[PDB]
């Protein structure tokens, strides 16, 4: 894994004329880990004492542990020697299945009358919001997976603005093949999202589909649909909306959009 580093060592060692903030912004993506380093004598509030964004309440929670909002994150805080100084190391490891979170860390030297602060901003969120369906050769099925990965609609603490909670999967319909929509393991999925896909697919009478099974796995619910043969071209968009689905204390879901392309061209 690659590592993103914010090293403040021997850079918060002056008395400024006016209030000064030295800022390190991190946008960790490809499973990257994070190291924050600063002199031991600095006052540091980080990871187990961070400022975390709370999408549900649209505010920031101060002096809190990031594990309360992204439970699969794990970090260690050690004293190390670095650049010839006694320093503190904040080492956060981000596994592939860790959920989104937006938090900040503060680093304040003493005896500067509070005029100088270091700040780390860690914004962990998805950056691919559109994919094509993926063929599972072992199961002989095309899958749109909204239960994990890039198109996950599970409620999370990710910093998303109100108009940016859409994720999209495109399925080029193959006649007589089973198609799977994987969704989070939540009661709301069968209560409301399943009516949503049924009303979407049945709205146009000329669309041939068969709902085969509503299946509950170990960590997802799947809608299993077979589309029959067709002749004419058609594009059908369905929305499975959890962008307003709340989950205490801070989580909000996303909107899963599925685009069915019916085409005998190309």
């Amino acid at each position: 894994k690659n590592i993103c580093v914010c090293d403040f060592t021997d850079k918060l060692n002056f008395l400024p004329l006016e209030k000064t903030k030295i800022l390190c912004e991190l946008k960790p993506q490809y499973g990257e880990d994070i190291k924050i380093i600063a002199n031991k004598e600095y006052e540091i509030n980080c990871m187990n004492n961070s400022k975390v964004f709370c999408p549900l309440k649209d505010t920031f929670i101060n002096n809190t542990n990031i594990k309360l909002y992204s439970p699969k994150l794990h970090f260690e805080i050690k004293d190390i020697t670095h650049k010839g100084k006694n320093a503190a190391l904040y080492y956060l490891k981000i596994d592939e299945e860790a959920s989104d979170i937006f938090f900040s860390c503060s680093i304040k030297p003493k005896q500067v009358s509070g005029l100088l602060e270091g700040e780390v901003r860690v914004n962990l969120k998805k950056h691919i919001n559109e994919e094509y369906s993926i063929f599972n050769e072992e199961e002989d099925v095309h899958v749109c997976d909204f239960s994990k990965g890039n198109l996950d609609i599970t409620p999370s603490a990710g910093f998303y603005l109100k108009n940016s909670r859409n994720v999209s999967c495109i399925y080029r319909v193959i006649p007589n093949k089973l198609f799977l929509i994987k969704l989070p393991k939540l009661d709301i999925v069968t209560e409301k999202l399943l009516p949503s896909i049924v009303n979407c697919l049945s709205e146009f009478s000329f669309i041939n589909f068969t709902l085969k099974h509503v299946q509950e796995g170990d960590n997802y619910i799947s809608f299993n649909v077979i589309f029959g043969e067709f002749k004419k071209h058609f594009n059908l968009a369905c929305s499975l909306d959890l962008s307003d689905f709340q989950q205490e204390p801070c989580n909000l879901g996303k909107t899963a959009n599925i685009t069915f392309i019916f085409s005998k061209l190309e």
Partner: nanobody, 120 residues
């Protein structure tokens, strides 16, 4: 990585003048505020003068009217003109980024600095 190189220090008599220079590389110089800093033995490093990308200046109260900070965007250099020097001005002088909000990537590891000694 930002690289900083100060020069121009030396021994000067009280009341004399001195001009410090600092060459900065590794960043887009003309978009950054810059500043001069100094540290004497047993004192904490202090920001002495700052200059915005738009050439607005600010000074520590103890050097107001005696020091002048300037910049040459074409050469990526910051200057500190010091007149009416006092023994209390004796320190190692450093330049670096300044500003109210500074990207950590723009704040370079401190250069070697240049020594200024004001004594008879």
């Amino acid at each position: 990585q930002v690289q900083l190189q100060e020069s121009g220090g030396g021994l000067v008599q009280p009341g004399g003048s001195l001009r410090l220079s600092c060459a900065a590389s590794g960043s887009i110089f003309s978009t950054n505020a810059m500043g001069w800093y100094r540290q004497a033995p047993g004192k904490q490093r202090e920001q002495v003068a700052t200059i915005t990308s738009g050439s607005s200046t600010n000074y520590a109260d103890s050097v107001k009217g005696r020091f002048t900070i300037s910049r040459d965007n074409a050469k990526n250099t910051v200057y500190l003109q010091m007149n009416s020097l006092k023994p209390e001005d004796t320190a190692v002088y450093y330049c670096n980024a300044a500003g109210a909000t500074i990207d950590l990537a723009d704040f370079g590891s401190w250069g070697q600095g240049t020594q200024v000694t004001v004594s008879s």
